[PDB]
Amino acid sequence: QSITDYNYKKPLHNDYQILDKSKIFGSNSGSFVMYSMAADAYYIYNEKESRKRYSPNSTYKIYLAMFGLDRHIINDENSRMSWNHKHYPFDAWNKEQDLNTAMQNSVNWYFERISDQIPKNYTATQLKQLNYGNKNLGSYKSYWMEDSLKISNLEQVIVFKNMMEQNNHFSKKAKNQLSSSLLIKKNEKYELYGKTGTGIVNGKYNNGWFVGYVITNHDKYYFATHLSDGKPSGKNAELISEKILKEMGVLN
Template sequence: MKLKKLWLLLILLIVAGSAATIPVSAEKQVKELEVEELFEGVDGTTVIKNLQTNQVYVYNKERSQERYTPESTFKIANALIGLQTKAVRDEYDVKRWDGVEREFEDWNRDHTLASGMRHSVIWYYQAMARDIGYENMANYVKQLNYGNQDISGGIDQFWLDSSLKISAQEQVQFIENLVEETLPIDEQHLKTVKRIMINEEFDTYILHGKTGSRLSDYGLGWYVGYIETDKGVWVFATNMAGSGSKAKSITLNILKEINIIKE
């Protein structure tokens, strides 16, 4: 009986000692943002993460976990896949305008991968998606772990109010992987896409981002990306019942409110 007790005590000591050697990982700090007034009564969410400290700011946590169609924010992933599969050579690869008049004047001309990102030219990225092909697209959307990974809505439509859906939390993780260059994409292509995402460049910060809007009714707007300052890098994703331009405006105001952007 004593022997059994000794063995039990020995086992407990070994387990306790082993447990003590396992480092306890620090939980991510999550701070609820009080920015309801910036959304002006419209339903929306924002997630912002500091990549140096893992500090996360969230407004409307419940919505941040809900998946929505990415709309033109998928151009980021689309560009990565297009470069990786050689559907386009580089950021200067030109596609000729087909002469069809579209709703935005900037779309009615020839474009490159970079200008197509800058002006959110849907037809350019639709043509590139067709060149990528269904098999390649499905494979890389899965490898990128992009949202629900469902491209069944059609090779040139699945991200536009269709089958592909992603949450703000998942967008932030995707952008973090892009910034950290841990995606299964060649380094040169990661750097190219990060470069063509630049929206604003000042002495104190560089803003990389992409808007997205559901053009049929402007019932969904996105702004996702990251900002580099001398104090660190923050990734972000905002979505709301509105336009992408409004989502961008709200994001910038929040970045100012929490002193990431200094006025």
């Protein structure tokens, strides 16, 4: 919208390492960013591309979930919402949800129902305090889905780390509840948490995301993959993330 809504230009005041992950990306285009808690250091593939701002799509469900927890729209005894009986083309959407099922199955109406209860001024205050991308709410409708709100791959990592790790106004209860909703994989070596996002424009994939974090016995890593071309799906961003985290030794 304005001159700075498509790119993030704030200098990293941290140690950083440039990665070459181009063979894993293959025919796809985009970037990968990871932050290590123990190192206080960023590892970035395609640094320029990582600072380009894009619609967060379903990754913004992270923040809607936190806002809904923070405003007591949902809690830990009850995060249930009944289905209004509108038929969706996905059967997982056609039923009652809780935060866990809605996050896992990316059920838009659940998060839309949350967003409708949140006053615009509260969201504006949150996005400022979080430094969330361009902070642009536009018409405040489904503003996180191929609309005015945009955020870069680099910012996805920085903003999520800061939200979760700083002592701020979100409670520990809310952060823990959001975390359980994001858990994908847990074994002896690691816990993998995250959320895919896909933007569909004219039936075509336009924008793929996977934003998350890994807890190991030694460290905690925040990461994000964005795809802008090739086959830019959430599914493919997740696959690419997994192979990169593996190569880097984060999953082992």
